[PDB]
Design a protein around this nucleic acid. Structure first.
Lengths: 363, 7, 99, 50, 49
RNA sequence: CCCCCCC
RNA sequence: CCCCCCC
RNA sequence: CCCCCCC
């Protein structure tokens, strides 16, 4: 008599299928990666500074240096456990300090350089040589505070701030990622650009994007470092900047859910349209899935987890059209490339949203 | 003298 | 890879899935293992998307019946149909029971 | 029918992500700082006056 | 020292003041769309303690 | 990115 | 397939 | 017998 038993609940079943599995994928079985022990933190910070204040021929492994500092901050065994828990069988290789050779430093000891697996030495000595030449040139020209030196403790966090700026747009295109990273770091990293006026933001951002694309476990390492930093009691200013950029990447890849919440908050009329009303059930199911996954549902597209895609709203064309129209009416949509299934609904929602934004009311 | 710098 | 042969690879996969029916279960277990990972590549997420686009395979009538209920069709109240809602509710109850 | 399930709670999730971490950041590993034992309190007070 | 307590967070204090002053424009439609996240921020304040 | 007053 | 704006 | 579309 009543159509109350006609009910499927496909999305809950799909989530149950995916989560309730007793088998674990073993990927990257034959590969290896590099970590740096925490006891070398100082001598990585220096290198994190030498990539900054100098103009270098090639910035290939700046991202690997930022990840090495992350390793020192978390520790070797913690980093190994983080990589193992992300689903990778990659085996970490320990960074080793090594005497350069006949080169002798001011302190009378042999100059100890870094040996990072996968990053060849020659690049390291090239970066160090270029930084030393630049610093000698600047001292010759004029006579350098403590905060304009490579030994400054906030240089690794500035490198990781460029890394986090590219991390924010990991669900985006490489060109848009680089453009947004540079155009934000010209404002976000203004102090560091005053202290280090010749640090190359485009190449560092490109290196970080390449690293995040290839070594997908380093996304999980980055997220664990952000969680460790945000749970600290104290920090520097650059560390709080890094945590701000990191938390500005939370809902990455899922702006449709956010704009749907916005459209609900804006009381759009076309949400009550009959084509839309046929679809509120699966939309509520998607948001219920978000609630069920909990706080980790936001880092799905950053981690690049295959489970991301259950949160997609691509099967609600009326809802997506209304949401995109409401976002466009309020000026939110910007240069968003999301497809509009129903152009008529989009235009109507845009018109109503603009009419509401122009008008004002007292409640 | 390059490697003799303060750093 | 501009010269990878999609028709022949698809034919090989169809032949394998038809003959070795346990490899369908192996494929489903691999999809479950991949979808439960924390990280992955882009192709792995593509694979899980295609895999979850095969979920209700062979059962599109149940989905279209849910759609017809959602579309508030009038002919669902037709007397010939009303004589049959009981077994339809039973089929959906069986779906819920299997889970 | 009702938009009661359309709900995100981003800030609670972000706080949960930040607080519920099992890793601790080890910073300032190579540095040192100075402390004065309590038994010297008098002779620091004098300097605090000078 | 206790005059430094809410340092860096004067916006929360002035929001409490605006609530206490019964400002009319708190009921403005643009504002009413935003009271949820404001209540969430104050709930986070309470949670941290 | 955030923060920015007075006591 | 998904994702795609700004901060 | 069942299944059969699109993404």
């Amino acid at each position: 008599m009543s159509l109350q038993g006609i009910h499927l609940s496909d999305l809950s079943y799909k989530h149950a299928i995916l989560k309730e599995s007793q088998y674990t994928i073993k990927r990257d079985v034959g590969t290896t990666t590099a970590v740096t022990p925490s006891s070398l933190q100082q001598e990585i910070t220096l290198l994190c500074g030498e990539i900054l204040y100098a103009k270098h021929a090639d910035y290939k492994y700046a991202a690997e240096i930022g990840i090495q500092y992350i390793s020192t901050a978390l520790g070797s065994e913690r980093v190994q456990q983080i990589l193992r828990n992300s689903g990778s069988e990659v085996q970490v290789v320990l960074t080793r300090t090594y005497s350069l050779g006949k080169i002798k430093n001011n302190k009378g000891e042999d100059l100890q350089m870094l040996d990072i697996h996968g990053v060849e030495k020659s690049w390291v000595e090239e970066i160090d040589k270029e930084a030393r030449k630049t610093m000698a040139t600047l001292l010759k020209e004029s006579s350098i505070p403590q905060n304009q030196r490579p030994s400054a403790p906030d240089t690794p966090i500035i490198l990781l701030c460029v890394g986090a700026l590219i991390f924010t747009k990991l669900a985006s295109t490489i060109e848009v990622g680089l453009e947004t990273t540079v155009r934000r770091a010209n404002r976000v990293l203004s102090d560091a650009l005053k202290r280090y006026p010749r640090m190359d933001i485009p190449k560092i951002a490109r290196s970080f994007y390449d690293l995040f694309e290839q070594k997908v476990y380093h996304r999980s390492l980055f997220i664990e470092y952000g969680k460790a930093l945000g749970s600290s009691s104290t920090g520097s200013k650059a560390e709080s900047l890094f945590v701000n950029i990191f938390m500005q990447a939370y809902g990455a890849g899922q702006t449709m859910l956010r704009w749907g919440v916005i459209a609900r908050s804006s009381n759009n009329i076309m949400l009550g349209h009959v084509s839309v009303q046929a679809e509120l059930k699966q939309v509520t199911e998607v948001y219920d899935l978000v609630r069920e996954m909990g706080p980790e549902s936001g880092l799905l597209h950053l981690r690049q987890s295959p489970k991301a895609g259950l949160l997609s709203l691509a099967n609600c064309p009326n809802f997506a059209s209304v949401v995109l129209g409401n976002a466009s009416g309020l000026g939110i949509i910007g240069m968003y490339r999301g497809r509009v299934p129903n152009t008529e609904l989009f235009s109507a929602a845009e018109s109503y949203a603009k009419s509401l934004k122009e008008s004002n009311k007292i409640n | 003298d390059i490697y003799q710098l303060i750093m």
